[PDB]
Every structure is written in structure tokens, then in C-alpha cells.
Amino acid sequence: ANQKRITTPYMTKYERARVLGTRALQIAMCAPVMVELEGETDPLLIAMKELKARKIPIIIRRYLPDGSYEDWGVDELIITD
Template sequence: MADEDYNEMDMGYEDEPIEPEVEEGAEEDVDNNNNEDVPDPLMAETEEKEEQESVERRRKTSKYMTKYERARILGTRALQISMNAPVMVELEGETDPLEVSSLTKTT
């Protein structure tokens, strides 16, 4: 079928209305209304108090890193090194970013 044949067929679709263009600097913040200081009428007072108490409570943590934390740190640093971030340790012929990041961690 040629292009002319498609123009004759009416599929029942209407053209969508054209949205007005927004100029630079005149952006609308309809969705970004931050009303943090306005209390939520659905939240009870007890829920607010419990939320504040959990924030103020002191955390008990270990002074040692878990294997997951260590893997995340080494992986992040290896990614940085692979994207040409400066290396802060002397290299001894290592080319693998993960090896270099583990050297950075041990020194």
C-alpha cells in the first residue's frame, strides 16, 4: 500500500492537543510543593512521637566492615579507577582496577 492509501483510512483516532511550550525560567512547580511543616491529618500523634524517638535513638554498630560493605566500597573504587580517576598509591605493575582498589584499601 502506498502512503496515499493510509491517509484515506480513518482509524477513529483524534489528534492529541498540543501542549503549550514552557519558556526557560518559567517552569511550573506543581508537583514539587514541599509542605513538610503542614501536619498530615491522617497521621496520628503517636506515630509522630514514635518516628522522632527512633531517629534520636543511638545506633549500635560493629567497628568491622561486613563482606558486603567491603565489596561495595572496593567495587565503587574500582569503577572510579577504570574511569581514569587518579590513583593515590604506588602501582607495582597492577592493571586490574579491582586489584588497584584493594591496594588503596589496605594502605
């Protein structure tokens, strides 16, 4: 699915914030826990821990109803800045 040419070398802020949300649910059910499992060790701040991810090994796939599946690995592009 190499229809990935019509995105700026940045994911959008909406997609990035929502993927942070779904990673929140991931690390908030039991554990996909990552590079530091609970090195940041704090009480009930579920969201504010996986915000510090900076690697995010997961894939997200962005579309258009009259278009195909423009896919994107989180790794292969620049971040919120």
C-alpha cells in the first residue's frame, strides 16, 4: 500500500493526540508497556506517562473516501513540532 506521498513530513495534531489516547487505553488495560515499563512511577495519572513515548511502535492509516489507504508508520515521520 505505497500510496503515501500526499502527507507533509508530519502527522497532523488530531491524529497524534488520538493515537496518544489509544496508547493510553492500551497501557491502561493491562500492559503493552514500553522502553521503560514503569520507570516513571506515579499514582493515577493514566495519560501523562505514555505521553513520554517518543518511539511509539504502532501503525496508523489515513484515507479519503475517493482514495486508497495512505498508510504511515509512526516511526517513519516527524512529530508534533
